[PDB]
C-alpha cells in the first residue's frame, strides 16, 4: 500500500503532544513568495495545521488535508475551518491547484509507492503550478524508535522518482539541518518542482 499503518497509528495516539510542536517557516515563506496572491493551495499531511493557518492568514485559498483523523481534528479546531481526512494516494484532483505544499509528510510514503503518489500530485496541479515536498535524507528506508516509517532517500533517488512520476519544467533542491520529533539530528531535503506550462 501507499501508506504505512504504524506511522499513522503513531499520529493518532500522540496527536495532543505532536500538535504542540510548530514547524519552521523558512521554506514556507520562500514557497509563498513564489506564488501569486490568493493562489489555490493543496496541503498534504498538514498535521496540526500551523502552516495552513499561516497560508490562510496570508490570503491563500488553502485546501488542508491530513491522513490522520485525529490530527485533522486538531487542525480543524485551530483553523476554525474544515480539515479533511485524506491519505496521499487518495488524491484524484485534476488541474485544480496553483500549488501543492507537503511539509515533512511524503517522507512517510513507502519507497515503491512514492512515484505513483507524485504522479497524482502532478495531475492535481494546474499547468505551471508549484509543488514543494521535504524529506528526511538517508541511505535506505527505515523506521524510528516511535515506529514511524521513513523512506530516507538521497537527492539522486528523489530526482529519479520525480522523473518517473512525470515531466517537470524545473526541479530545485536545497537542504537544511534540524532535529526531528525524536530529538535526533537529521538533514532535510526540500524539493520544489514546477509543472510544465500549457
Ligand atoms: C511529520 S508530520 C508533519 C506535519 C506537518 N506538515 C508539520 O511539518 O508539522 C507527518 C504528517 O504526515 C501525515 N501522515 C502520515 N502518513 C500519511 C499518509 N499516508 N497520508 C497522508 N497523511 C499522512 C501524518 O498524519 C502527519 O500529520
Amino acid at each position: 500500500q501507499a501508506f504505512d499503518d504504524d506511522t499513522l497509528r503513531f499520529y493518532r495516539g500522540n496527536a495532543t503532544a505532536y500538535a504542540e510542536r510548530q514547524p519552521r517557516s523558512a521554506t514556507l515563506t520562500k514557497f509563498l513568495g513564489e506564488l501569486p496572491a490568493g493562489a489555490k493551495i493543496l496541503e498534504l499531511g498538514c498535521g496540526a495545521g500551523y502552516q495552513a493557518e499561516a497560508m490562510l492568514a496570508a490570503g491563500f485559498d488553502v485546501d488542508a488535508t491530513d491522513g490522520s483523523p485525529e490530527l485533522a481534528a486538531e487542525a480543524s479546531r485551530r483553523l476554525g475551518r474544515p480539515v479533511r481526512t485524506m491519505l496521499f494516494h487518495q488524491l484524484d484532483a485534476i488541474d485544480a491547484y496553483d500549488a501543492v505544499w507537503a511539509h515533512a509528510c511524503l517522507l512517510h510514503v513507502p519507497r515503491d509507492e512514492l512515484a505513483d503518489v507524485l504522479k497524482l500530485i502532478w495531475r492535481a496541479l494546474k499547468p505551471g503550478g508549484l509543488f514543494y515536498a521535504s524529506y528526511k535524507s538517508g541511505e535506505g528506508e527505515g523506521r524510528d524508535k516511535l515506529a514511524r516509517y521513513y523512506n530516507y532517500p538521497s537527492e539522486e533517488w528523489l530526482r529519479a522518482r520525480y522523473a518517473e512520476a512525470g515531466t517537470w519544467a524545473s526541479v530545485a533542491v536545497e537542504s537544511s539541518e534540524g532535529k526531528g520529533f525524536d530529538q535526533e539530528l537529521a538533514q532535510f531535503l526540500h524539493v520544489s518542482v514546477r509543472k510544465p506550462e500549457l
Side-chain angles (χ1 to χ4, degrees), residues 3 8 11 18 23 45 47 66-68 71 86-88 103-105 108:
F3 66 106
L8 282 166
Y11 292 108
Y18 186 85
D66 193 85
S68 171
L71 277 179
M86 184 188 83
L87 294 171
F88 307 133
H103 191 254
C105 61
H108 284 143

Side-chain angles (χ1 to χ4, degrees), residues 29-91:
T29 297
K30 176 180 174 181
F31 175 77
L32 297 177
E34 304 171 306
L35 297 177
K40 303 171 182 303
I41 307 176
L42 165 68
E43 171 163 29
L44 296 174
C46 71
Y50 289 98
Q51 303 193 301
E53 178 174 47
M55 290 184 258
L56 288 167
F60 299 89
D61 184 352
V62 186
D63 178 21
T65 72
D66 193 85
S68 171
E70 288 65 33
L71 277 179
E74 173 66 63
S76 66
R77 176 154 51 65
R78 166 175 290 289
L79 305 178
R81 303 195 193 207
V83 176
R84 54 206 193 78
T85 301
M86 184 188 83
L87 294 171
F88 307 133
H89 69 90
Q90 295 183 302
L91 177 63

Side-chain angles (χ1 to χ4, degrees), residues 115 118-119 122 161-169 196:
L118 298 178
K119 185 185 298 182
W122 187 97
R161 299 293 79 73
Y162 271 81
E164 305 180 328
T167 306
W168 302 104

Side-chain angles (χ1 to χ4, degrees), residues 114-134:
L114 185 61
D116 293 315
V117 169
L118 298 178
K119 185 185 298 182
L120 297 174
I121 298 173
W122 187 97
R123 291 171 172 289
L125 284 161
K126 291 178 176 295
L130 179 67
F131 162 41
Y132 163 107
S134 61

